[PDB]
Amino acid sequence: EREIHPDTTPVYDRNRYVSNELSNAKYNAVTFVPTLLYEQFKFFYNLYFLVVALSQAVPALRIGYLSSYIVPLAFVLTVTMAKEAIDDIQRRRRDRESNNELYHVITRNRSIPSKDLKVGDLIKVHKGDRIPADLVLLQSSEPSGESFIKTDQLDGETDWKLRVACPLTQNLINRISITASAPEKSIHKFLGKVTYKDSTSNPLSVDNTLWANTVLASSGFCIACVVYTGRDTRQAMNTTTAKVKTGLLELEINSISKILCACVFALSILLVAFAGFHNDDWYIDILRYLILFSTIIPVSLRVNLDLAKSVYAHQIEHDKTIPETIVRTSTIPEDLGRIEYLLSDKTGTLTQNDMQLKKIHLGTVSYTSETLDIVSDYVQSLVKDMSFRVRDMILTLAICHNVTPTFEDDELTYQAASPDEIAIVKFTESVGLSLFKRDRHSISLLHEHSGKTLNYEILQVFPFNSDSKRMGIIVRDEQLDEYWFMQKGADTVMSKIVESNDWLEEETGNMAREGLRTLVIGRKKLNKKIYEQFQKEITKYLEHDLELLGLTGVEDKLQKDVKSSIELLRNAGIKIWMLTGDKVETARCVSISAKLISRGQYVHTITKVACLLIDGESLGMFLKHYEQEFFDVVVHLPTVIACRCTPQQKADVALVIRKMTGKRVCCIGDGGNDVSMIQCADVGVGIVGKEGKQASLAADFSITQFCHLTELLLWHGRNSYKRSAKLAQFVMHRGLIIAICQAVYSICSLFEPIALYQGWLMVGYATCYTMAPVFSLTLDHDIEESLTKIYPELYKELTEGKSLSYKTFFVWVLLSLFQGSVIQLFSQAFTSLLDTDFTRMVAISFTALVVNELIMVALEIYTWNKTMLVTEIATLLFYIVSVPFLGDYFDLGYMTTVNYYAGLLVILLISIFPVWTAKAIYRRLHPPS
Ligand SMILES: Nc1ncnc2c1ncn2[C@@H]1O[C@H](COP(=O)(O)OP(=O)(O)CP(=O)(O)O)[C@@H](O)[C@H]1O
Ligand SMILES: [Mg+2]
C-alpha cells in the first residue's frame, strides 16, 4: 500500500523506488555458470567425461594430442549454449534498447528515457508506442474514457481489451492523487483508489490500469500515471524459470554409462594385473589406461543426441502433413514415443467448439430445431400466458449475453469471450428476433424483427466469474420504461435462490442424459428507488427472490474423426482417461457418442463426501488418504472418467501418477481452465483455433485440434525412439570394438596399450570417419507416413523396453567382443606380429575396422533413400585419399598387396556373415507388414 502524489516529484525521483532498469546477469553470471551446470553435473555421464577431461590436468597423464582433448569439451559446450546464450544475449539486447526508449513528460515538457521515468508522474503515451511500465489510466483521447489495449506479450491474451478511465478525472489539468496496494502476483486482478481535492474517493480495478507490456490503441494518446516500480511489476513475479525436464532415454543412457564405466574399469584392472604389476606405480597406470579406454564414446554420444534433437525438431516442423506446429521445449522432444496415458479435456481439444441449440423447454412445452413457426409468430406478435413467457424468454436470451457484433454485407458476425451465448444469439436471430449493434461500454441495446425497431439499455451488469457460475444484469426500457433484473447461470447455485419451484431438477436431468449441456434463466421486476440505493455502492443483496423463466439445451458437434483416432489409440494399446469439470450425465453421454466405450464395458459411478466414473471431491478423497490402493485400481482399468475437477486435482493426478509408476504420460489441454496440467506434464501440446491461447503458448507442443498428435505419436515418436536406440547401439558398438582392439594388442604385446593407436588416427575415427553413417541412420525409416494408421500395434513392442535394457547392453557388448576379437586375432596371426612391420599391422587393423563399421551401417538399413547412399561412399573415399597425404605419418607403408585385399575381404566376410544371416533368419521369423 502506497499513496501517490504527482506534485511530490523528488521523494520518488531520488530514491525509495525501483528504477526501470532491468538486469539479468552481470557480476553474477560467472556464479551462474556452475550451478546451472550443476544440474548437468547431477547426471553421471557428464560427470564421467568431465572427469576424463579433468584427469589430464596432472602434468603426467598427457597420453594423446591436445587436439584430441580440447575439441570434444569445447564442441559440447558450444552446442549446449548454442540454444540458450543466443536467447540470453537477445533478451539483454531488447532489454537495453527498451530501457532507453524516449517518452514525453507532461511536467518536464521533454522526452526522457525509461531509466529517468519514475512513479506518480503523468505521461501521455501514444497509439504507435507500447506502454513502458505499469500505469493507471486517468485521462484518454476519447471523451468516454474507454480505449482498447493489447497485451500479446504481457499475457496470452490476443484480442483487444476494454479499459475505461475515471469519470471524475477524465474531464481534467489539476493534480490528482492515487492510493495503491502491495505488490501481488495475480494477472487478472487490481485494486486502488483515487483521491482528488477535498478528499473525494474514487474506485479503481483491473478495468482502469495498464501494465508493463501493454500496447495502446483506439485513441491517439492518453494520460496515465505510473504505479509499480521496476521489480515491483508483475512481469518480474508472474514469470518464472522453466524447470528442467528429464527423459527416460537419457536416464537409461546414464545407467548404461555407469555400467560401461564399471566394465572398462574392470578391463583396465585385468590388463594391469596381466601386465605383472610392475613400474611400481599402479594407480597412474590404471588411470591413464582408463582414460585411453574412455575417450571415444561418452562425448560422441552427447553431440549425436543433440544433433538428433535438432533434426527431429526440423522434421516435426517441416511436414506438409503437419501444418503449423510449434515445439517450445526442445530439451526432451523424445518421450512422446513411449507414452501410456492420455489426460485431456473435451473443450476444443476433443470437440470442434461449434455450438447449436437443439431443445428448449418451458412450462411442460418443448420446442426443438423443428416447429419454429410458433416461436416465429410469437416474435412477430411481440410488436396466451405461455406465449408471453416464450417472448420474455427470447428477450432474456437476446439481452443477458455479453456478445459483441461486427457488420458486413449480410449474416452479421458475432464474437465474445464465451461462445455459448454466440450460439444463443444465433438461435434468437434464426427465430426472427435479430439483435444488432452493441456498444458494450455505453448503454445501448438494439433489436429489430419483422416489426418495429426496439431499444433498451442496461442499468447495471456483473461480469461472469469462473467461481460464481453466474452473471446478472438490470435493464431499463425506453419504449415502456420498466426495470428488468435478469440472472443467467448454473442451477447448482441459484436453485435455492430463485424460488421453491419443482420443475427444474428432473428436466435438467432429462436434458442431461439427452447429452445436452444446460444453463438456466431467471427474472425479477424491480423499481427505481431500490435500483438507486443499490447504485449507492455485498453480493448477497443483489439476489433476493427471483422467478424461473426456463432453460435451454445446446449441443456441440464432436471433433473431426474422433472415432478413428480413438480406435487407433486402443489398437496401439495406449491408455486414455477423461478428466473435466463437467456433469456426470453429459460426460457419459459424450463419451458414448465419441465411442470411448465399446460394447459391454460396464460403467460405475462414485459419489461420496469395465468403466468407472468418479466425482472431483471423491477423486480428492481417494487421492487424499486412500492413495495407493486407488492408484493400483486406476492403472489396470482401460478408461477413467472424472467430473467436477478444478485444476489442482488435475495437477495432483499427474504428479501422483508420474511418481507412483515412473512412466511418461501425455497431458493435452487448452484454455485457462487447465494451465497446471501442462506445466506439470512430461509433454504439453497446444491447441489452436479456440479462444483460449495462453495455455497453448505456455505448452511444449502445438497441434491443430487433435489429429496431428496421433501421427506425432505413432509415426514420429516410434521412429525417433528406434533411431536413437540404433545411435546408442552403434556408438557403444564401435567404441567397444576399438577398445577391445587395444586390449588384444596389449595382450599380444605387453609393452603398452598406448603403442597401438595415438594421434590423429583416433581423433579422425572419433569424429570424421564415423559420424556421417550415424546421421544417415538418423534419417532412415521403414514405414511410410501414410501406412502408420493401418499398423499401430507396433507400439506394444516399445512399451516394455526390449531394445534398451541390461540384456541389450550385454548383447551389444558380446557382439562387439566377437567382431573386434576375430579381426584383431586374425590380423595378428596372418601378419606375423613383430616390431618392424608394426605399421602394417596397425594400418590393416584401422582399415579393416573402419570398413567393417561402414559396411555394418549398411547392413542395418531398411530403406535406400537417394540422399543416404552417398554418405558412406564419401567417407570411404575420404579414408582412401586420407592415407597417402593427409595423415601420411602414422602407419606408412605399401599395403597394396594382392594377398592383402584377399585377406581383408575374407576376414571382413567372416566377421559380417553371421550377423547378416542372423538378421535374415530373424526377418524370416518375425515378418512385419
Ligand atoms: N461464463 C460462464 N460462467 C459460469 N459458468 C459457465 C460459463 N460458461 C460455461 N459455464 C458452465 O460452467 C461449467 C464450468 O465452466 P468454467 O468456468 O470451468 O469454464 P469451462 O471452460 O470449464 C466451460 P466447459 O466446461 O463447458 O468446457 C461448464 O460446465 C459450463 O457449462
Ligand atoms: Mg484450460
Side-chain angles (χ1 to χ4, degrees), residues 670-674:
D670 62 358
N673 62 328
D674 51 29

mmCIF file of all heavy atoms in Angstrom, residues 670-674, ligand 2:
data_model
loop_
_atom_site.group_PDB
_atom_site.id
_atom_site.type_symbol
_atom_site.label_atom_id
_atom_site.label_comp_id
_atom_site.label_asym_id
_atom_site.label_seq_id
_atom_site.Cartn_x
_atom_site.Cartn_y
_atom_site.Cartn_z
ATOM 1 N N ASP A 670 -6.226 -27.058 -23.129
ATOM 2 C CA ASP A 670 -6.291 -25.717 -23.696
ATOM 3 C C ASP A 670 -7.135 -24.809 -22.812
ATOM 4 O O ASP A 670 -8.013 -25.283 -22.084
ATOM 5 C CB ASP A 670 -6.821 -25.758 -25.142
ATOM 6 C CG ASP A 670 -8.244 -26.303 -25.255
ATOM 7 O OD1 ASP A 670 -8.849 -26.706 -24.242
ATOM 8 O OD2 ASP A 670 -8.765 -26.328 -26.389
ATOM 9 N N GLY A 671 -6.848 -23.518 -22.858
ATOM 10 C CA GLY A 671 -7.574 -22.544 -22.075
ATOM 11 C C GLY A 671 -6.972 -22.367 -20.689
ATOM 12 O O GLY A 671 -6.082 -23.105 -20.259
ATOM 13 N N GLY A 672 -7.485 -21.359 -19.980
ATOM 14 C CA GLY A 672 -7.028 -21.094 -18.628
ATOM 15 C C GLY A 672 -7.533 -22.089 -17.607
ATOM 16 O O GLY A 672 -7.051 -22.100 -16.470
ATOM 17 N N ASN A 673 -8.496 -22.931 -17.989
ATOM 18 C CA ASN A 673 -9.095 -23.857 -17.036
ATOM 19 C C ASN A 673 -8.229 -25.089 -16.812
ATOM 20 O O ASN A 673 -8.579 -25.947 -15.997
ATOM 21 C CB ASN A 673 -10.485 -24.272 -17.517
ATOM 22 C CG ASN A 673 -10.448 -25.000 -18.846
ATOM 23 O OD1 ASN A 673 -9.594 -24.729 -19.691
ATOM 24 N ND2 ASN A 673 -11.378 -25.928 -19.040
ATOM 25 N N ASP A 674 -7.127 -25.226 -17.551
ATOM 26 C CA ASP A 674 -6.244 -26.374 -17.382
ATOM 27 C C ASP A 674 -4.771 -25.994 -17.511
ATOM 28 O O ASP A 674 -3.992 -26.733 -18.113
ATOM 29 C CB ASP A 674 -6.606 -27.486 -18.369
ATOM 30 C CG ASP A 674 -6.698 -27.001 -19.809
ATOM 31 O OD1 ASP A 674 -6.007 -26.028 -20.179
ATOM 32 O OD2 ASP A 674 -7.470 -27.609 -20.580
HETATM 33 MG MG MG B 2 -7.534 -24.619 -19.995
#
